[PDB]
């Protein structure tokens, strides 16, 4: 009886203060699709998608725009909507860009639904808002910049940072991780991220050396889809293997966890299938005894983690900061959910115009 | 910021038109605990619990009343509340009557939360109301009465019935199913329930005979906790083994499904952990590819099934009809969710006095 | 040193004589992306992609056009090109539409490489052209039309047909298969395809009924990604379960085969990763002892099957006949590779204008 | 021919010298249900139940009182009695409070049966009394108190102590364990108990550090029901993982041991199902090669361990000391079974009146 | 339409500068069968076989000569040819010398096919030529010679060497490996090869000691066919176990990898089944997440590795240097594919006459 009455998308390419250097390439800007889901209640649901590379940006927007025809005039009922989209894309493949588009809709629909009820999303999911510990997420920065960003993060109150590694030499990975340790002291988390850049034996070798340095976790040591390879790496480690950002739907998470690919999980609110997929993922993580963190989408992830029984860390990487009001705050390194209906995303309408593609 | 302000319980032992005869004993009356959860928003959540035997009835109500102090002044946030209860009871054992009590609180809290937002529970969960196919659930009734109840159910538009079996002789099981089949015809579901009465070999022998007869499923053939035994029974059958009414929390369901105990599941809204446990349960049934039905608690299960990705059947067994307004209805054998906020449970306050224990 | 010098795409929505009705919806038209890969040797590679639904069509073409910059001036070396694309897209997700796009490029590059050496693709792969047995692939056509199409296919020399099933009732599935069987006789293959429409228990029940009827294989009985569910279905059957058209890359095929999901495979030349993915796929089917058929893309699949150690059937479903010269022919039900360099795809340039989206 | 002729229960709330602080909450008093089972032989069987929290105390007593109706007038035959109770509670769930109540009956019935035959329980089970090594069981006490209690225990002749850990920081766990080591010297056991307070990766991390300190075992590192999680923790340890106090019946122990959850077991005489369940548990522990200790109930556990083929340690935590005569003694840290019929429990009738609820 | 028109073989016994001493015997000379495959295109395909021992040399040549009857007049289509040979030797056993003979034909046929198209083999397989890192492969040389050869290899630009170990005492293995380390410095690979000489426990013991020295891999620690034994050794190592040179066909590799025998692979271009088998092996190595190196046959292996998705190292052991022109070069320790059609093998016709048997 509340119906979806419009979908508007905007492709933006937002320059970042700190380009996200990885072992497999640099993300120099954030290509985002900003989503507005109009309703017959008058409120408008907001979400966004991260396209990773500009190469995928216009394709993802086009996809969403063409998907509008299947959602406009449907009830604002995110779970029913997700089931209908799964069905419609049964043949084409309910994964990749199609799944990402469906998730952006889902996240906007839940924001709208929080607005219909005039309640923060976390409360609509039946949980209380609580502060959620966050790590400041850096990149493949080299010793000088990694040291400078680590000092800044510690001054801001964060109790952990993540760096991206996978330099040509292991000694280079170690050099950056040790330099960070000098900047932050011994009572402080250092997560490390390989971004899929190693083969299994190289990952076992580099990971055991990193484990001697006392890192908090080792994230995507090898090809994301290779769950058996992850398991093989994990079998040789005391430190936990972390993955999940590339799981497309909870069904991919289920396969990973069923064979013991990792001891931590971090679904991406977009890839996992939005709020609807995330809640399913949290049910899996709970049964499999897996502490569950977030990947990007800090705005919605602060809500989702508060509803997550095995909630672990929130990834602070502010991809949408240039176009979204800073209503999400950080007190003593913990993300604090703003007291606003739905997700608490408010567009910076003047700023958006600068970045339109 | 809606708070819980009070808890009231009432223990009743309600007469049933048809005593529930099973192979392991008769439930001749319904021992229920009726729960009222008061809130600072002025709305009152309702739910009830089934104690199975009057022997457990006063103990269950006493437990609930002693739990009142731990929930009064807590936010009305059923997910956070469930985590607090899991923690408070982790030494004593968060299972059995304690888990049942926590579930009754959970179902009242979600009823209340629905009332806070003036919305049916199904919509609060992000799904659309839809009619849910229901089977009319009977008992170990003997040939004559089973056949009558089946005809009557067919006349009312039900497309399936369940009968409870496990007579002293397999011939008797078969004579009951055959007489039902002759009276309802070939295009009609007949589910059967052994209520845990057989050892594994007897279950294989009886179940293979029933499979030759055409039954819709075979339910709890052996001891409920014996998941491996169920798996052994299932391995000898084409017809699906059904279970789940006895799973206490989604963690028991997870263990049963992890080893292939059954091809169908039917969690009990109370034993699975209320709405909170049910939603986690539905995530599991989806990943494991298990069609998921309900057990008892028809009033809330109509809502819950509507939000369940692998929704199968609703069990129609009206344990609480003597004390609850008939707002749930059946059209062509399908449960129709009432257009009322929360669950649509309204006490028949005139009738409750008759049955107070 | 042959280089890629340009990429051109054209999106078309081509009418089909017979809409492809499936249990999960109808593909009434063929949304295709037609690909031209220009090279510094003056030859032009051709391939096409199938978008399944017009909803994905513009997005897919936009993605391809945005990929033009990353392949222009790269050597015409399809294997090296595929590794570069896997790497460029490893963050975004080398699956779904992105993987499909990479595959379309791959098939054009191999077409081009064949033209560079003036040799049919099959011979470039180190194999001899041989006739490949083909089944005529039909749809959820109802009794009358299915029987007509089967007779017609028999008259044309096909030794098998595939019909799509999953009618509301199992009786309907059986009535269609029976009427086909009476009309084509005992010595004739009837494949059936459920198009992911059944849950596991329904698939076991329906499949065991069809097996009693004599069918050649049972295809995608359940959700395509549910490899474990397929394994459960297969374990209850003598008749082979068939799948693979939805595997995105040989890595998905590897996971499905590793757990015994099916006894037959049919990769889709586009989804499996083009010629490069197909060849890897054929290595896997060989080791796992899986007879391997094709899905769609009949023009290139005739070449690919000829080089496939466990080659089984070619699927005849002419999605692109309206825009591609009929150089592939059928003699006594067998696909005959044209004596032309590369794939033997020649555009009907007069007809393409009619269907441009 | 000897019959049960009465059941009397008394709820008591007994203040403890040393409140049992755990990582998941404090047990400040012992809420017990004292049980007297009258017989036609005139002797009265004595046992008690531990309710863990006062919240559960009145519910458990009520449950027992209502259960009296099923046991009065039954033969005093604990094994037959247990089978009847299992049956009666088949539907309600023979676990949790119901199972605990059944176990209290069973323990009283075996005490009575020892009295009928004028023989210590251990001799009735067909074993000789032998001294059984005991550890003095402490709590989450901090460095000052842990040190003081450790010194006292060593002076009393105990050769091991247990402390409860799970402080906010690992360095705090280590600090307490090391301080204890200073108080007791190097030839002395220090067991440690996490009381379910850690997730799997935190447990692996903390446990490997504790293992470097030379602790005797690591008890319930994670959620008690999560056997797979325990196994995962155990797989990374040389030190044994200890659990079992929360197994409700030998059927829960069987599941744990079947998947290698732990290398030690310690059933709780109440939760395991009393004497009847304990003897079954000991048969399992023997076959699985698991040294079996006791949890609480030191009075009866001294008998049961003497009949246990893989008997390991007795937990000395004197919960019922204020209301039971000190007939169980300790010589050189070994529990010495008193020469008294049955269990050797004699009520302190004057003391009981002070603690009645 | 291009046909095989002749096969000529020449048995040669070529003295080596450095006899290949192994723990199981010395290879003092290289017994090779040089192969020329004449075609109707006029070009002649070249390959060679390594017979290992002179004892096998004349038998292998005779075998090839008798096999000529099945290939002459067949199309030059290596994949079709391989399938025909597999069939013809179905009964006799398509393994050992027979398989090796088939592989020599296959390698010559692909060389010829590269020549027909006037293109380097690597380009015919659809890949670009790239430099491939090579290690200089030494033998069971003792400290003096191992040191001298290690210095030479480092001067030549190689970044790794392999030595063969399995001396009577472990201290001798360690002495040679440490002496090599002194000669090459710390930033340099030392692979070690046991040539099947140890039993599983001896291999675990020696391997853990070698692992402390920092060797790059441990190759064939035990009997080549004992995959389960390899797995057992691998289970106790962080350093990777390397094997594969003795896999006869990709079907043997598949079995090894299916049970986790090793974390690295190195097929032998001859034993694996030539180019046709190698491409299949590379598809397996990719799916199993196994970095794949080469064994001997450096001329063709430089091509094959460039087409190998998980390409690791090229083994530089120049067995055929005395009879093949040095068109393969090494720049900074990387093998550089010559710009010549096919494999780039050109006979030293004057040199061959000196070594004929
Ligand atoms: O792997 C990543 N994050 O954890 C990542 C990758 C690209 C951009 C931002 C983050
Ligand atoms: O097994 C049962 N139902 O499916 C059942 C048992 C007791 C009372 C009501 C129902
Ligand atoms: O399932 C299928 N084929 O086998 C199919 C589906 C859609 C269009 C064409 C074919
Ligand atoms: O975990 C425990 N003991 O080993 C425990 C818990 C509560 C009270 C007494 C003991
Ligand atoms: O094991 C070997 N190489 O890696 C080997 C064996 C004999 C001759 C040459 C090499
Ligand atoms: Mg990451
Ligand atoms: Mg039942
Ligand atoms: Mg199909
Ligand atoms: Mg304990
Ligand atoms: Mg070797």
XYZ file of N, CA and C in Angstrom, chain A residues 17-127:
333
model
N 41.070 12.157 -1.832
C 42.270 12.706 -1.182
C 43.393 11.670 -1.309
N 43.061 10.431 -0.969
C 44.041 9.380 -1.022
C 43.543 8.288 -1.922
N 44.059 8.265 -3.166
C 43.737 7.213 -4.134
C 43.932 5.856 -3.475
N 43.049 4.918 -3.767
C 43.172 3.614 -3.158
C 44.077 2.719 -4.003
N 45.381 2.801 -3.723
C 46.376 1.924 -4.347
C 46.196 0.498 -3.839
N 46.118 -0.467 -4.761
C 46.141 -1.892 -4.387
C 47.262 -2.616 -5.156
N 47.591 -3.830 -4.710
C 48.562 -4.691 -5.386
C 48.122 -5.084 -6.807
N 46.827 -4.945 -7.116
C 46.310 -5.264 -8.452
C 45.867 -4.036 -9.273
N 46.255 -2.838 -8.835
C 45.837 -1.597 -9.495
C 45.342 -0.506 -8.545
N 45.332 0.729 -9.037
C 44.878 1.882 -8.260
C 43.422 2.263 -8.589
N 42.629 2.505 -7.541
C 41.331 3.162 -7.669
C 41.575 4.658 -7.371
N 41.762 5.457 -8.421
C 42.160 6.863 -8.250
C 41.023 7.799 -7.856
N 39.803 7.428 -8.271
C 38.564 8.169 -7.989
C 37.499 7.176 -7.559
N 36.427 7.662 -6.942
C 35.309 6.786 -6.654
C 34.179 6.974 -7.691
N 33.989 5.987 -8.586
C 32.839 6.039 -9.478
C 31.627 5.450 -8.770
N 30.635 6.299 -8.512
C 29.430 5.945 -7.758
C 28.178 6.201 -8.570
N 27.158 5.394 -8.309
C 25.838 5.644 -8.809
C 24.989 5.985 -7.605
N 24.513 7.227 -7.541
C 23.669 7.690 -6.431
C 22.217 7.398 -6.788
N 21.471 6.831 -5.848
C 20.133 6.325 -6.136
C 19.077 7.029 -5.262
N 17.969 7.431 -5.890
C 16.805 8.028 -5.225
C 15.567 7.222 -5.643
N 14.895 6.648 -4.649
C 13.738 5.776 -4.850
C 12.541 6.535 -4.275
N 11.697 7.050 -5.174
C 10.554 7.864 -4.797
C 9.422 6.949 -4.383
N 8.605 7.403 -3.443
C 7.503 6.579 -2.945
C 6.179 7.331 -2.900
N 5.083 6.586 -2.800
C 3.771 7.189 -2.647
C 3.547 7.764 -1.238
N 4.480 7.511 -0.310
C 4.456 8.139 1.017
C 5.161 9.486 0.924
N 5.712 9.811 -0.246
C 6.394 11.091 -0.429
C 7.871 11.076 -0.046
N 8.244 10.211 0.900
C 9.647 10.101 1.276
C 10.405 9.439 0.128
N 11.700 9.741 0.058
C 12.610 9.245 -0.964
C 13.751 8.460 -0.307
N 13.874 7.191 -0.679
C 14.977 6.343 -0.233
C 16.254 6.676 -0.976
N 17.361 6.736 -0.235
C 18.685 7.039 -0.821
C 19.646 5.875 -0.606
N 20.391 5.501 -1.643
C 21.548 4.612 -1.507
C 22.545 4.994 -2.586
N 23.672 4.289 -2.609
C 24.601 4.410 -3.726
C 25.312 3.084 -3.974
N 25.866 2.961 -5.173
C 26.630 1.796 -5.618
C 28.048 2.260 -5.891
N 29.007 1.378 -5.642
C 30.403 1.653 -5.986
C 30.679 0.798 -7.219
N 31.141 1.418 -8.306
C 31.398 0.708 -9.582
C 32.845 0.209 -9.726
N 33.727 0.587 -8.796
C 35.128 0.144 -8.744
C 36.059 0.756 -9.751
N 35.700 0.621 -11.002
C 36.331 1.254 -12.101
C 35.305 2.051 -12.933
N 35.723 3.216 -13.354
C 34.990 4.030 -14.297
C 34.533 3.277 -15.551
N 35.260 2.252 -15.932
C 34.926 1.425 -17.043
C 33.546 0.811 -16.869
N 33.144 0.575 -15.642
C 31.881 -0.076 -15.334
C 30.780 0.921 -14.974
N 31.150 2.181 -14.780
C 30.204 3.196 -14.267
C 28.929 3.422 -15.126
N 29.102 3.785 -16.396
C 27.936 4.049 -17.236
C 27.090 2.791 -17.455
N 27.735 1.638 -17.557
C 27.015 0.376 -17.727
C 26.100 0.115 -16.510
N 26.618 0.382 -15.310
C 25.846 0.096 -14.090
C 24.649 1.058 -13.971
N 24.860 2.324 -14.323
C 23.769 3.288 -14.281
C 22.671 2.907 -15.280
N 23.085 2.587 -16.503
C 22.163 2.169 -17.561
C 21.343 0.964 -17.094
N 22.035 0.023 -16.460
C 21.401 -1.193 -15.981
C 20.297 -0.855 -14.973
N 20.657 -0.085 -13.951
C 19.681 0.423 -12.995
C 18.505 1.124 -13.663
N 18.787 2.003 -14.630
C 17.706 2.774 -15.273
C 16.750 1.859 -15.995
N 17.273 0.782 -16.571
C 16.434 -0.147 -17.291
C 15.696 -1.064 -16.339
N 16.253 -1.225 -15.147
C 15.627 -2.037 -14.103
C 14.466 -1.313 -13.462
N 14.448 0.017 -13.585
C 13.363 0.831 -13.022
C 12.002 0.304 -13.427
N 11.895 -0.198 -14.658
C 10.606 -0.660 -15.185
C 10.044 -1.823 -14.360
N 10.911 -2.662 -13.804
C 10.398 -3.740 -12.977
C 10.033 -3.362 -11.528
N 10.481 -2.214 -11.025
C 10.192 -1.873 -9.616
C 9.150 -0.765 -9.405
N 9.038 0.162 -10.357
C 8.089 1.266 -10.221
C 6.673 0.683 -10.192
N 5.856 1.210 -9.287
C 4.548 0.652 -8.980
C 4.487 -0.635 -8.164
N 5.636 -1.182 -7.777
C 5.635 -2.319 -6.857
C 5.519 -1.784 -5.419
N 4.908 -2.566 -4.509
C 4.957 -2.157 -3.097
C 6.390 -1.981 -2.575
N 6.565 -1.016 -1.682
C 7.851 -0.806 -1.017
C 8.061 -1.912 0.040
N 8.467 -3.084 -0.403
C 8.542 -4.219 0.519
C 9.821 -4.878 0.102
N 10.954 -4.478 0.713
C 12.248 -4.868 0.132
C 12.421 -6.384 -0.058
N 11.944 -7.178 0.900
C 12.077 -8.644 0.808
C 11.296 -9.249 -0.373
N 10.060 -8.801 -0.570
C 9.265 -9.236 -1.719
C 9.893 -8.769 -3.042
N 10.412 -7.546 -3.019
C 11.083 -6.967 -4.173
C 12.309 -7.787 -4.554
N 13.125 -8.137 -3.563
C 14.325 -8.943 -3.833
C 13.975 -10.290 -4.478
N 12.946 -10.961 -3.967
C 12.498 -12.252 -4.515
C 12.044 -12.126 -5.982
N 11.386 -11.011 -6.306
C 10.906 -10.762 -7.678
C 12.107 -10.513 -8.608
N 13.080 -9.732 -8.135
C 14.269 -9.462 -8.943
C 15.102 -10.743 -9.170
N 15.237 -11.575 -8.145
C 15.936 -12.853 -8.270
C 15.305 -13.704 -9.382
N 13.991 -13.703 -9.423
C 13.229 -14.424 -10.391
C 13.390 -13.881 -11.773
N 13.180 -12.598 -11.932
C 13.361 -11.946 -13.242
C 14.754 -12.153 -13.845
N 15.778 -12.271 -13.007
C 17.142 -12.408 -13.525
C 17.695 -13.827 -13.416
N 16.780 -14.758 -13.133
C 17.042 -16.199 -13.045
C 17.890 -16.715 -14.205
N 17.547 -16.252 -15.409
C 18.165 -16.802 -16.627
C 19.423 -16.053 -16.973
N 19.362 -14.723 -16.914
C 20.518 -13.888 -17.240
C 21.701 -14.073 -16.276
N 21.427 -14.437 -15.024
C 22.485 -14.586 -14.017
C 22.350 -13.516 -12.951
N 21.836 -13.909 -11.790
C 21.546 -12.974 -10.715
C 22.817 -12.775 -9.896
N 23.821 -12.179 -10.546
C 25.132 -11.996 -9.952
C 25.796 -10.783 -10.615
N 27.000 -10.415 -10.173
C 27.745 -9.320 -10.830
C 26.985 -7.998 -10.839
N 27.080 -7.254 -11.942
C 26.430 -5.938 -12.038
C 24.931 -6.010 -11.774
N 24.268 -7.032 -12.297
C 22.842 -7.196 -12.064
C 22.525 -7.306 -10.572
N 23.238 -8.185 -9.871
C 23.072 -8.308 -8.420
C 23.394 -6.989 -7.688
N 24.456 -6.301 -8.119
C 24.827 -5.013 -7.501
C 23.725 -3.963 -7.655
N 23.133 -3.912 -8.857
C 21.996 -3.016 -9.134
C 20.823 -3.369 -8.227
N 20.475 -4.653 -8.144
C 19.393 -5.087 -7.250
C 19.636 -4.658 -5.793
N 20.884 -4.789 -5.323
C 21.277 -4.371 -3.956
C 21.138 -2.861 -3.709
N 21.508 -2.050 -4.694
C 21.308 -0.587 -4.585
C 19.840 -0.212 -4.426
N 18.969 -0.918 -5.148
C 17.535 -0.753 -5.000
C 17.097 -1.148 -3.582
N 17.538 -2.319 -3.146
C 17.202 -2.826 -1.836
C 17.614 -1.861 -0.728
N 18.847 -1.351 -0.789
C 19.323 -0.382 0.215
C 18.512 0.923 0.218
N 18.131 1.392 -0.967
C 17.265 2.582 -1.048
C 15.866 2.265 -0.509
N 15.368 1.052 -0.773
C 14.008 0.688 -0.350
C 13.919 0.627 1.181
N 14.960 0.070 1.818
C 15.033 0.044 3.292
C 15.229 1.413 3.899
N 16.027 2.248 3.261
C 16.088 3.644 3.700
C 14.683 4.278 3.651
N 14.003 4.166 2.501
C 12.617 4.666 2.366
C 11.723 4.070 3.441
N 11.888 2.777 3.722
C 10.985 2.129 4.670
C 11.230 2.655 6.080
N 12.491 2.888 6.432
C 12.808 3.601 7.681
C 12.167 4.976 7.747
N 12.195 5.698 6.629
C 11.525 7.002 6.542
C 9.981 6.936 6.675
N 9.318 6.003 5.990
C 7.876 5.770 6.187
C 7.519 5.662 7.688
N 8.357 4.949 8.447
C 8.091 4.736 9.859
C 8.765 5.740 10.745
N 9.449 6.714 10.149
C 10.095 7.777 10.915
C 11.038 7.159 11.984
N 11.835 6.171 11.582
C 12.703 5.477 12.544
C 14.084 5.143 11.926
N 15.184 5.278 12.721
C 16.473 4.858 12.160
C 16.393 3.401 11.703
N 17.065 3.080 10.607
C 17.054 1.719 10.072
C 17.330 0.649 11.133
N 18.334 0.900 11.970
C 18.738 -0.087 12.973
C 17.547 -0.481 13.849
N 16.717 0.503 14.206
C 15.523 0.251 15.020
C 14.439 -0.505 14.250
N 14.337 -0.249 12.952
C 13.380 -0.968 12.114
C 13.748 -2.470 12.035
N 15.046 -2.770 12.117
C 15.528 -4.158 12.054
C 15.385 -4.791 13.426
N 14.904 -4.005 14.383
C 14.625 -4.508 15.715
C 15.791 -4.464 16.682
N 16.828 -3.689 16.363
C 17.993 -3.562 17.252
C 18.130 -2.152 17.847
